[PDB]
Design a binder for this molecule. Sequence first.
Ligand SMILES: O=S(=O)(c1ccc(-c2csc(-c3ccc(F)cc3)n2)cc1)N1CCOCC1
Length: 278
Amino acid sequence: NLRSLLVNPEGPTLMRLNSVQSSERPLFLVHPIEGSTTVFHSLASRLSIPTYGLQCTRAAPLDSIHSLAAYYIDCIRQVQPEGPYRVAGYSYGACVAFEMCSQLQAQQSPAPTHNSLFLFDGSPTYVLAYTQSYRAKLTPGCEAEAETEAICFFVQQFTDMEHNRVLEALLPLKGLEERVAAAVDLIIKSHQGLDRQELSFAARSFYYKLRAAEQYTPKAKYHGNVMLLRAKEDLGADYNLSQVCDGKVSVHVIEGDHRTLLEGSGLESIISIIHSSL
Ligand SMILES: O=S(=O)(c1ccc(-c2csc(-c3ccc(F)cc3)n2)cc1)N1CCOCC1
């Protein structure tokens, strides 16, 4: 449960998530904001098609969602040099996976790709909505306050700490690196064996991941068909994919909350959707 929100920063970007060895083209699953593909382990074991995960390591460029997506496409081509391509993303990862498919569409433009894109409870706008809901709590222009807010939320994912207690400890500090180091020391106190470097990279990258999400708009609409599998403020029906897609937008409501949308009842529906979708 606990170290599943962490990435080995020295780990591989592309990783097998099942033993299925077949001719059928693989499904690539893109990480949530935590960067790890652990959240997909149940799905990947249950799928009859070869499944890989994309995890966000030291190798990943986080200057933009566009750079991240270009890098993930190059990694995919080390096992599947040619399309068509099956891509899914969960939560934050739904934004990224959508960018990857747009780039792939542009690579073959204007010939249509028969690529498959699945979004698990995310979209370019669903992530954007979340970031502002945090900017709402901040003095505009105060970057130190934004850094503090992001890193506080990260520390809260590991500890039972009250919001304002973490806010106090981070707000004074010189810059991001100091805040990152303060956050790692708090988490290390609760879990000493955890790796310094692992946590440092996780805290730092959490801030840059959020920033890239804020700066993202696709260069144009995604022309491919898309499927949204969203959990049981409210953004919209199709998570406003209609504004970023001029292809078929398919919406399915899936049992569970944002976190439990990939387990139990929700997981059964996702597996049946993917298995028929082929
Ligand atoms: O991947 S998510 O889409 C996600 C989006 C935003 C934040 C966040 C926390 S704090 C902050 C911030 C933003 C802008 C600032 F200026 C300062 C802080 N953003 C976390 C997770 N997902 C939402 C659904 O449940 C799981 C997580």
